[PDB]
């Protein structure tokens, strides 16, 4: 009967809460009390990247820590050389309503998508000296929010369908489909070993997925509004989330727990981005109040502010060698900090 | 200094910057619009993932987008105007239409965007009022006390019982507009009949007033 199935949910939902309080003996703040504070972090702008003519929505770093890609609402993708501020390529787009970027680990392809419900792949290293479209992936019924290359032949996407997918690029077909969210999915991040990933949706929930099997393993719920950004810890055993309720939270995989909270009494705007440092001691967040904050991940006290933009910050990222950080904004500028 | 190859890459970059400037100049003379309306409203017959449309009037280009909501509405934070279409013939769904207009008018990302409101299908409204089978007062009780104000512009060949019906519905939309707007953006109403040919001219005239307010606000006259 329908009623009997509903009752089992209450029996199994309350049993999980019991198994969470049993494992909660001490807190992260109590253990980390006898550690010296980080200090006062002072960073300064080193480069300013100009040439876009509209709002900037996404960026991603190349794996050599010198090249990066950016998307804007003028229908252009641009590839930059960070050391000299030279422009390498400028790719024109068919649809101007883009929302995401991705750069391949080898460096031969870039990807973009948006409110047209299609993920496009571009070939960068060909004869006849031109970047040209190599594949168009169709099958979603809503807009694309995120995409991250898994390999030179696999890509993972998230949509406003309440669905994620895994594609084989050569064939152009969906290999697996991930279901379970009740709201639009806004972000995904991959594990260092590239065998798991996490996602966050408008239902105030976060989920951990298995690439090979196609199932959902864990579900985390502590927020009170939409989740906009997500990122793994370098170890691969934790991740961080940022919401419209003006908070950041840290979750642990092996305990199914929320470990720490990052909030202040005079911050009332939402989060747009999160990113970790190389050792995982600083947590970087972008806000709607036009600047960014630098948190101590182990003690939850602020350490600095990056304040140089005159519109909201929309994207963020740290290099693979830990040497620099970049920001984009609705004011059509990119800045590298150090 | 700079090496020979590092000097040729710099000359390549300037040619990219040069081309990025012509496209920005062409894009500055096209006006962008967004189309909204649930259904039963005749959006697709107003001007004769995303569908697009283009038209020209007095040597000015227009570009109109319909998407077929609280998440992707941020993208349209800088359009010139929003076109909202309502069917005013069936009385069972106005309260749903009024709730929709209220959420768009009171959105955080749309606090500088004006709205051109189209009340469509006024030929069917006249038939329902004249026939007398359905009564507006059943759904909106305060219709009994309403009466036409002293500024009755109404057209030559209308029954006064049809003017009363149509001036009541328009007040229900302007009351929300003037409720809490702080004067930073306004609403323009119109009456249409799904066979009229003068709607592209009416969008052109309203967009000329919207730009005028931006002009005399940028140069501090207000």
């Amino acid at each position, epitope marked *: 009967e329908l009623d009997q199935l509903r009752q089992e949910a209450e029996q199994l939902k309350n049993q999980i809460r019991d198994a969470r309080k049993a494992c909660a003996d001490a807190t992260l703040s109590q253990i980390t009390n006898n550690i010296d504070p980080v200090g006062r972090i002072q960073m300064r702008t080193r480069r300013t990247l100009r040439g876009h003519l509209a709002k900037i929505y996404a960026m991603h770093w190349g794996t050599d820590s010198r090249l990066l890609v950016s998307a804007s609402q003028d229908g252009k993708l641009i590839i930059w050389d960070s050391y000299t501020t030279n422009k390498v390529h400028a790719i024109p787009l068919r649809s101007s309503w883009v929302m995401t970027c991705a750069y391949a680990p080898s460096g031969n392809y870039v990807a973009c998508g948006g409110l047209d419900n299609i993920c496009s792949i571009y070939n960068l290293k060909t*004869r006849e*000296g031109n970047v040209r479209v190599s594949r168009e992936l169709a099958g979603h019924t809503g807009y694309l929010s995120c995409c991250r290359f898994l390999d030179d032949n696999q890509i993972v996407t998230s949509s406003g369908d309440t669905t994620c997918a895994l594609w084989d690029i050569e064939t152009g077909q969906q290999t697996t489909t991930f279901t379970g969210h009740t709201g639009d999915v806004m972000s995904l991040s991959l594990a260092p070993d590239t065998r798991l990933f996490v996602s966050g949706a408008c239902d105030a929930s976060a989920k951990l997925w298995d690439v090979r099997e196609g199932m959902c393993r864990q579900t985390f719920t502590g927020h009170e509004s939409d989740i906009n950004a997500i990122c793994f810890f370098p170890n691969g055993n934790a991740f961080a989330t940022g919401s419209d309720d003006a908070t950041c939270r840290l979750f642990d995989l092996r305990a199914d727990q929320e470990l720490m909270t990052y909030s202040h009494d005079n911050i009332i705007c939402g989060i747009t981005s999160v990113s970790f440092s190389k050792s995982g001691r600083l947590l970087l967040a972008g806000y709607d109040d036009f600047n960014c904050n630098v948190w101590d991940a182990l003690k939850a006290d602020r350490a600095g502010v990056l304040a140089g933009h005159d519109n909201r910050v929309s994207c963020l990222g740290v290099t693979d060698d830990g040497m620099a950080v970049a920001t984009g904004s609705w004011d059509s500028f990119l800045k590298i900090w150090n | 200094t700079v*090496s020979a190859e590092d000097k040729a*890459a710099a*000359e390549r970059s300037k*040619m990219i910057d040069k081309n990025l400037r012509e496209d920005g100049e062409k894009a500055r003379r096209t006006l962008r619009l967004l189309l909204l309306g649930a259904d039963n409203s005749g959006k697709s017959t107003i001007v004769k993932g995303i569908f697009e449309t283009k038209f020209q009037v007095d040597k000015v280009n227009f570009h109109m987008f319909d998407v077929g909501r609280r998440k992707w509405i941020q993208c349209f934070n800088d359009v010139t105007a929003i076109i909202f279409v309502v069917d005013s013939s069936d009385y069972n769904r106005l309260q749903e239409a009024l709730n929709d207009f209220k959420s768009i008018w009171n959105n955080r990302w749309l606090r500088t965007i004006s709205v051109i409101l189209f009340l469509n299908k006024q030929d069917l409204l006249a038939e329902k009022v004249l026939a007398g089978k359905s009564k507006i007062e059943d759904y909106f009780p305060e219709f009994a006390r309403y009466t036409t104000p002293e500024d009755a512009t109404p057209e030559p060949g209308e029954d006064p019982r049809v003017t009363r019906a149509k001036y009541f519905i328009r007040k229900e939309f302007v009351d929300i507009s003037t409720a809490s707007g702080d004067g930073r953006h306004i609403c323009y109403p119109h009456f249409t009949c799904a066979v009229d040919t003068e709607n592209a001219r009416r969008i052109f005239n309203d967009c000329k007033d919207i730009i005028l307010q931006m002009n005399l606000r940028e140069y501090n006259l207000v």
Partner: single-chain antibody
Amino acid sequence: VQLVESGGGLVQPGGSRKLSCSASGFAFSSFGMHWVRQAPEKGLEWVAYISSGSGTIYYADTVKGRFTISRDDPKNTLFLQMTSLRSEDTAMYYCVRSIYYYGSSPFDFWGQGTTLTVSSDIVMTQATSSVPVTPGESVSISCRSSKSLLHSNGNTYLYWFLQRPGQSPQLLIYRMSNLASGVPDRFSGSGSGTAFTLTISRLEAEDVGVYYCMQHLEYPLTFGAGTKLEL
């Protein structure tokens, strides 16, 4: 990709001539172009350069004031105009493409040639001139520069070329370490400032010819003398 040269023949001393190069198969306007010539029994030599967008032109000293280089992007053609021809200008002329950005590889494609018969600088030398080799062995070639080719940005600007009998040269290595597209894995180049080497492992046939070293710090661009490999 194709490049076809026209013009060339028998000219009396003091005369004039015009050469043409027509491209097909690639985006001609995004590339730079070079002219390179080869004396009937001697080695390679650089003549002139035109830039993408036509904003930079360079000439060699032996031709400056006599030759003129021009391009016509809509018609996909390249020109070279002569004046006051002497007997030192009897050679075969090549048409070369090159593109410059981060991670690029200039001097990829060389066309065929046309024959014309008329009736301070960085010097670098390849000491050896001939080497007898047998299949299945391992060989090394050496090039030595005058001043250092290593820049303050960490780049060493040295190139390697191979010209098979009866054919036009092709690229093997760019910037002293990088292997070009289509070249087998047995080729590998190393070296330091002012000393360079190239290594061939498991030598096979169709690898016999002349090998050239070139520098790209400064203009003019200078070549070596060559190194035969015979059976």
